[PDB]
C-alpha cells in the first residue's frame, strides 16, 4: 500500500512510477512500472487521469 | 434515503465502494476489493449546477 504509485527519479528528467491498480467507475486497471519525463525549468505535476484533449 | 450496505449492478457516483463481485450459477467467481487499501480510486467528475460566469 505504501509504495503504490510512488514517483521516484530514474535519471535526468525521466521519473519512474511504480506499479499500481486504480478503480474507474468500478473497473480495475493495473499499471506496471512506467517512466515519464518532467518539464525542464518548471514545477510539473505528475498525476493519473484523462485530459479534455485526450 | 437511509444509509446502509447495498448491492447494485452499477456503482453510484456518490457511494462508498466496498467490493465488486462477479458471481455465476449461484456461486461467486471473483471478488475485487474497491477500498483504498487495494486500489486508488479515480474520483467522479461532478459538475456544478451553475456554470462559471453565470
Amino acid at each position: 500500500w505504501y509504495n503504490r504509485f510512488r514517483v521516484t527519479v530514474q535519471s535526468g528528467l525521466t521519473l519512474s512510477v511504480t506499479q499500481g491498480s486504480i478503480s474507474v467507475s468500478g473497473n480495475i486497471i493495473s499499471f506496471p512500472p512506467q517512466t515519464i519525463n518532467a518539464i525542464d525549468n518548471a514545477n510539473s505535476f505528475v498525476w493519473i487521469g484523462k485530459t479534455d484533449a485526450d | 434515503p437511509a444509509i446502509a450496505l447495498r448491492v447494485s449492478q452499477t456503482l453510484p457516483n456518490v457511494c462508498i465502494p466496498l467490493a465488486r463481485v462477479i458471481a455465476a450459477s449461484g456461486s461467486v467467481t471473483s471478488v475485487t476489493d474497491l477500498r483504498d487499501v487495494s486500489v486508488d480510486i479515480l474520483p467522479p467528475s461532478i459538475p456544478d449546477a451553475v456554470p462559471v460566469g453565470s
Binding site: 511504480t18 506499479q19 473497473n27 493495473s30 506496471p32 512500472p33 | 465488486r20 462477479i22 471473483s30 475485487t32
Partner: peptide, 23 residues
Amino acid sequence: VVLDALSSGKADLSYVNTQLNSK
C-alpha cells in the same frame, strides 16, 4: 533484477481473467 522486472511488468492471470470477464 530481471525476475523482479518481469513480476512487476507482466499481466497476472487473476487480473487478466477478472478484466476479461468484466467486459
